């Protein structure tokens with residue numbers, strides 16, 4: 015099963031109970047964005063991140079009464095149609111708001127049962143993606159495909175280190191390709207145990223395909239209330255990219271000397287084949303539109319891995 | 328019966344009838360569609376060899392001036408990028424794309440690929456979260472039918488085409504329309520089946536390697552390359568990888584007879600075989616700009632993946 019989260023007086027996490035940390039319900043988010051939850055029917059704002067006032071420019075109480083209808087007039091019917099009751103928690107809808115306080119915000123919404131989860135992040139506003147797609151497809155074998163993928167991602171993102179991290183049948187991992195800035199250790203060829211990416215994280219990574227830690231020294235921002243009014247239970251944040259990263263996992267990034275980290279799941283035959291895995295030495299908020307490019311690349315790599323593995327077997 | 332290609336018309340080959348269907352060398356027509364321009368150049372020196380006859384009007388230069396310069400001089404910023412992206416021996420399927428600001432012609436999209444020692448350069452005029460939203464909707468579709476319907480509707484919304492169909496191949500290479508989105512008033516093609524020579528054998532092989540092709544105006548005359556043969560080889564210039572390549576006169580007649588002014592399709596490729604086609608029709612001529620066509624190319628790949636996934640959920 016899982017332990018209760020901390021804020022419901024559950025046990026603190028060690029290296030003895032790695033498999034039972036409820037990484038999906040931390041009750042908090044990373045501070046480079048803001049999150050609201052809301053009722054599926056009424057559009058009634060039920061929870062907000064204590065930092066919402068910053069991003070939205072709204073007097074705190076104003077929000078926690080109001081309706082999405084009021085708050086987001088153009089958007090609220092689109093949401094209603096895009097995310098019908100009963101849809102999967104994996105389905106997401108995005109829009110760009112030109113919002114008074116903040117030039118442009120990206121809005122990302124998904125639905126978990128009766129709750130809409132809304133994420134707001136700063137945003138903005140060429141051929142590198144098309145060029146990359148063809149490059150991946152003409153790679154002659156899996157090894158070269160891995161090399162092209164890591165190089166392409168590094169060029170698109172500027173990340174200090176990009177790796178392709180492949181799982182063995184027992185969930186033992188192996189860096190099979192790596193693109194990195196001069197003057198970093200090389201992780202190429204190394205293997206790491208199956209507990210470094212525990213079971214409940216690999217399950218979540220099979221369904222929700224992209225996660226990041228923008229700053230491995232930043233404090234999480236609580237949800238208020240912490241419990242969902244609807245249920246008097248924890249809000250599932252598994253499909254939110256703003257969800258706070260497991261403190262166990264930021265301590266391993268800090269010990270590695272990483273200040274920022276991103277990963278894309280590569281999913282083949284319904285299973286987690288591997289990860290595109292990025293490091294930055296310093297804090298780094300990759301903007302939403304560039305993340306989208308990596309999300310596309312994730313799908314394309316998933317296709318090409320199968321194609322390429324089929325021409326060996 | 329499978330038989331080798333006839334020589335093209337310009338090398339004294341025969342004209343095409345319903346008899347010798349499968350023998351038209353559709354990849355070497357010696358000509359392009361008039362909404363863009365094409366140059367060929369030597370892959371090592373960058374000497375310009377062939378150009379479409381309309382090139383002066385896209386590029387704003389006399390032929391003899393174009394042909395008298397190397398790509399190093401014509402494309403000083405792109406020439407080194409081309410050479411890195413398209414190394415000798417690379418496959419003909421690999422494409423490099425850039426946007427140019429050309430004085431006379433505005434923003435041009437440049438698409439380049441390499442066939443042996445030849446570079447092929449295509450120039451076309453070029454111009455929010457719809458793709459991301461579509462990607463997730465496709466993935467959440469519960470079964471093959473719902474996927475097919477979401478895919479057709481999405482493509483129609485992105486493009487404005489009068490008709491978008493998912494055309495699936497059976498094992499005998501007959502195809503059938505399994506989903507479609509269509510303009511009000513058009514008759515349905517849903518559930519209709521069509522004989523295997525409707526899209527013949529030398530075209531299904533090409534459609535497995537080069538995944539997008541179009542006919543922007545089913546009545547437009549093709550524009551010859553000049554000279555017609557590659558001076559490197561005194562042989563035909565391979566154009567199967569060029570979206571501008573002229574369309575077969577046999578296929579253009581079939582579309583005209585159906586009342587179609589513009590046609591486009593993306594290949595859906597599963598396990599190395601051509602599974603199907605995202606086929607679009609428009610009743611009037613219609614040019615879809617290169618950046619919009621890129622969205623369809625990306626959806627072609629997504630759909631190939633999702634078709635595998637939906638079919639595996641099915642035994």
Ligand SMILES: *C/C=C1/C(=C/c2[nH]c(/C=C3[NH+]=C(/C=C4\NC(=O)C(C=C)=C4C)C(C)=C\3CCC(=O)O)c(CCC(=O)O)c2C)NC(=O)[C@H]1C
Nearest residue numbers: 028029032037201206210211215259260263266275276277
């Ligand atoms: C007691 C549990 C431990 C643990 C937990 C844990 N790990 C993740 C996610 C990841 N762990 C990774 C480990 C590595 N990073 C590397 O660079 C290498 C090798 C070169 C390894 C082996 C990786 C890559 C991930 C994926 C996420 C990412 O890319 O940032 C989680 C889930 C975190 C979350 O969802 O927020 C958890 C709970 N890791 C351990 O090492 C042990 C001590």
Ligand SMILES: *C/C=C1/C(=C/c2[nH]c(/C=C3[NH+]=C(/C=C4\NC(=O)C(C=C)=C4C)C(C)=C\3CCC(=O)O)c(CCC(=O)O)c2C)NC(=O)[C@H]1C
Nearest residue numbers: 345348353516521524525526530574575577578590591592
């Ligand atoms: C003897 C010659 C014949 C012939 C040749 C031919 N056909 C193609 C390509 C296509 N034919 C298609 C036929 C259909 N159009 C539809 O709308 C439907 C069903 C609703 C069918 C069955 C299609 C869809 C294509 C693909 C191109 C496209 O999407 O428009 C070619 C190749 C063209 C080229 O590569 O330039 C050729 C040579 N087709 C015949 O029916 C006979 C007359």
